[PDB]
């Protein structure tokens, strides 16, 4: 075992983790969505996985 | 033999088969499709298709 | 993808 916790300004590391995780999440979510906006009269007759 | 109600919720209904699924397989085939060195007396080296394994 | 022939047992006899 190994344990000796910092303080309860652990929150001041939890706060910056929330910021860092929010940037990572919002960035890759926004490009997770962005390649589907158009879809253009979806598969009328045409064999394309749009 | 005895009926009662042989379906109870779980492990009274599990002494039978209980959903045989995804049996262990030789879909990729060792000793025939691979472990193979019966490769024909060809002409040239034409291509070896590289695929990014997404799945 | 083409294969060239293999003369694995061809001991060629000719006449003339």
């Amino acid at each position: 075992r190994g344990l000796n916790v910092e303080l309860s300004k652990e929150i001041s590391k939890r706060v910056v983790e929330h910021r860092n995780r929010f940037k990572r999440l919002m960035f890759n979510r926004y490009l997770e969505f962005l390649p589907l906006l158009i879809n253009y009269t979806n598969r009328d007759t045409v064999g394309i996985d749009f | 033999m005895y009926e009662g109600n042989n379906m109870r919720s779980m492990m009274g209904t599990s002494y039978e088969d209980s959903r045989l699924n995804k049996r262990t397989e030789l879909n990729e085939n060792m000793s025939i499709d691979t472990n193979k060195s019966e490769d024909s007396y060809g002409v040239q080296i034409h291509s070896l298709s590289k695929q990014s394994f997404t799945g | 993808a083409a294969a060239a022939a293999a003369a694995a047992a061809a001991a060629a006899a000719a006449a003339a």
């Binding site: - | 009926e3 009662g4 109600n5 042989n6 379906m7 109870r8 209904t13 088969d17 959903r19 | -």
Partner: protein, 89 residues
């Protein structure tokens, strides 16, 4: 009323046929249920014959004994949420 009271104590009831008229019965990867193995609450109206679950064997064909969940996927009982707000209230 007797069904919905049974559903909110989370016991999976099973409605089927008894003499073609849908009496309630109690019902406690996919491994299919067929027989009347489960506990049966009515007295003599039991089917005494081929029961089945009528979900995925076909759409509309198999002999009826369908189980009804209170909630499709169960995570927490809502008798705890009703304890959660009533003290704050």
């Amino acid at each position: 009323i007797q069904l919905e009271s049974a559903l909110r104590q989370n016991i999976n009831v099973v409605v089927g046929e008894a003499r073609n008229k849908q009496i309630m019965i109690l019902g406690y990867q996919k491994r299919l249920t067929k027989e009347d193995i489960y506990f049966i609450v009515p007295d003599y109206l039991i089917p005494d014959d081929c029961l089945q679950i009528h979900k995925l064997y076909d759409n509309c064909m198999s002999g009826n004994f369908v189980v009804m969940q209170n909630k499709p996927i169960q995570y927490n009982s809502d008798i705890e949420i009703i304890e959660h707000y009533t003290d704050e209230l």
